[PDB]
Design a protein around this ligand. Structure first.
Ligand SMILES: CCc1oc2ccccc2c1C(=O)c1cc(Br)c(O)c(Br)c1
Length: 515
């Protein structure tokens, strides 16, 4: 009397699973908002150096002559690479000579310019305040944003590991609801810190709790349903991320202050926590540990929801004990890691699998967090990524049976990569075509994640099937951390970050055909 018999006899498809799927997919949207808020809360607006002549009204009253704002801006600030006033320099001694056109204003030495020691001036047309405006992440401090994003992703990884151990030892629902509470508390606290390091630490905690809640939601959604309806729930979970993208765009358009935006994003998790208590605990894990009475109570409850009390009556403790006896043992999990790499037949498939996992995190998170440089309307670009993803994710499922198994991975990585590499070659004059290629590039990478999850299981044997999938997750998380740090290469040239973000997926796709 295995557990699947009990799950089928109490009802696997009836009602209850739909309600549980809704209640566990709703928080995924806000999980996505928390993950991708860093694009909007930390946007860098156009800035110019602070000038006593222009900004200070006391010096404004002392100006001899009614000089226009553009004239004074040209007098005070050297021109920049894009014919705009330069961001990080200022004339120490106001140059009245530059106004006259009889002198070619080209012989300016760096010794005549000094760093902006009196602050900066930011435009507030599109954003009222970001962390860059608040803590002056400009010039010499421009490299700290990728550090913050990498800290967030490392927090995701550490939280995933810690919550894995905690859910293995204590259960699913308890860790899930405590993750809800910790998300809410940590976000609310982070929305009020005065200094940058405290903000980074509390974002680290938020990321840890987000990883925990995502993993526990996935596990609970998978475990309470029969194997026949698993892919439908996985597809719903995948669509949850696109809906979260759309929600992130809408909410970021709604609120233009980073503190208020963070508070609004972190608020609904308390409402999730308050009702998370009513959710039934997973019966299989309760059977595994040995709390037969609690598992029987949950089984009776869930069968009562399915309006199947007549079949629910005959459940007995001895059947539960037999099911516990029939549970497979996890002792061999220690040696499953070694046999993946030591076996030559298994070694080559793992390396190809890891590269596919690695390419997704490295490419997507290095670009999905940098929509500022890919276009002007960040609000429209954020929503379009979610919108384009849905047709591609569903369309890729149909493509599986027709063109075969092997060709799927290569096509799902080469095409998104080539679009990114085509971004450089397109002239900057055509902005409409320039932005469209980037949208299709990152938008199509969503089908890559969905494909690899299904693909990895079927290759490996059932004995080590679970372990191999876990290794791919670690590589994807590890590749995410290295993503934002690539943007530091932009000082050499603007095309350098895009070349790495395009070349890497292509090689991963081209090496994927050898499986
Ligand atoms: C925003 C969700 C998320 O944040 C992470 C941080 C570190 C490693 C993985 C993730 C991760 C995913 O797994 C993921 C999976 C699928 Br399928 C998607 O279509 C999108 Br979009 C994201």
């Amino acid at each position: 009397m295995a557990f699947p018999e009990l799950l089928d006899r109490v009802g696997g498809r009836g009602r209850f699973q739909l309600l549980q799927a809704v209640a566990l997919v709703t928080p995924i949207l806000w999980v996505t908002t928390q993950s991708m808020l860093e694009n909007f809360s930390a946007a860098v607006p156009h800035h110019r150096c602070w000038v006593p002549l222009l900004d200070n009204s006391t010096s404004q009253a002392s100006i001899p002559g009614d000089f226009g704002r553009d004239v004074l801006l040209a007098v005070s600030i050297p021109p920049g690479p894009d014919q705009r006033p330069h961001q990080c320099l200022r004339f120490r001694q106001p140059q009245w000579q530059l106004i006259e056109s009889n002198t070619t204003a080209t012989n300016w030495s760096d010794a005549d310019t000094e760093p902006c020691e009196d602050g900066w001036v930011y435009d507030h047309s599109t954003f009222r305040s970001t962390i860059v405006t608040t803590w002056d992440l400009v010039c010499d401090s421009q490299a700290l944003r990728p550090m913050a994003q990498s800290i967030f992703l490392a927090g995701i990884l550490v939280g995933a590991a810690v919550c894995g151990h905690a859910s293995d030892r204590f259960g699913r629902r308890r860790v899930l609801t405590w993750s809800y509470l910790l998300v809410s508390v940590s976000g609310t606290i982070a929305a009020l810190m005065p200094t940058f390091p405290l903000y980074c630490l509390f974002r680290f905690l938020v990321a840890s709790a987000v990883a925990g809640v995502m993993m526990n939601t996935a596990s609970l959604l998978m475990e309470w349903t029969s194997a026949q309806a698993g892919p439908l729930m996985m597809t719903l979970n995948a669509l949850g991320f696109s809906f979260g993208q759309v929600l992130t765009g809408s909410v970021a358009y709604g609120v233009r202050s980073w503190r208020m935006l963070q508070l609004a994003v972190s608020a609904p998790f308390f409402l999730f926590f308050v009702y998370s208590w009513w959710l039934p605990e997973s019966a299989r894990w309760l059977i595994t540990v040995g709390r037969l009475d609690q598992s029987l109570r949950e089984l009776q409850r869930v069968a009562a929801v399915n309006r199947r009390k007549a079949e629910a009556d005959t459940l007995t403790v001895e059947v539960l004990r037999s099911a516990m006896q029939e549970e497979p043992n996890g002792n061999q999990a220690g040696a499953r890691l070694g046999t993946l790499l030591h076996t030559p037949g298994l070694r080559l498939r793992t390396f190809i699998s890891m590269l596919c996992w690695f390419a997704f995190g490295f490419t997507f998170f290095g670009l999905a967090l940098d929509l500022q440089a890919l276009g002007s309307n960040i609000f429209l670009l954020q929503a379009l990524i979610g919108i384009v993803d849905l047709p591609v994710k569903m369309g890729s499922l149909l493509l599986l049976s027709r063109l075969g198994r092997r060709l799927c991975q290569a096509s799902s990585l080469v095409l998104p990569g080539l679009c990114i590499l085509a971004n450089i070659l397109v002239p900057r004059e055509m902005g409409i075509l320039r932005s469209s290629l980037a949208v299709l590039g990152l938008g199509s990478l969503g089908a890559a994640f969905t494909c690899v999850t299904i693909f990895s299981s079927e290759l490996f044997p059932t004995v080590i099937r679970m372990t191999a999938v876990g290794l791919g997750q670690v590589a994807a998380r590890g590749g995410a951390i290295l993503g934002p740090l690539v943007r530091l290469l932009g000082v050499y040239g603007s095309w350098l970050p895009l070349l790495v973000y395009g070349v890497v997926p292509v090689l991963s796709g081209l090496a994927a055909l050898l499986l």
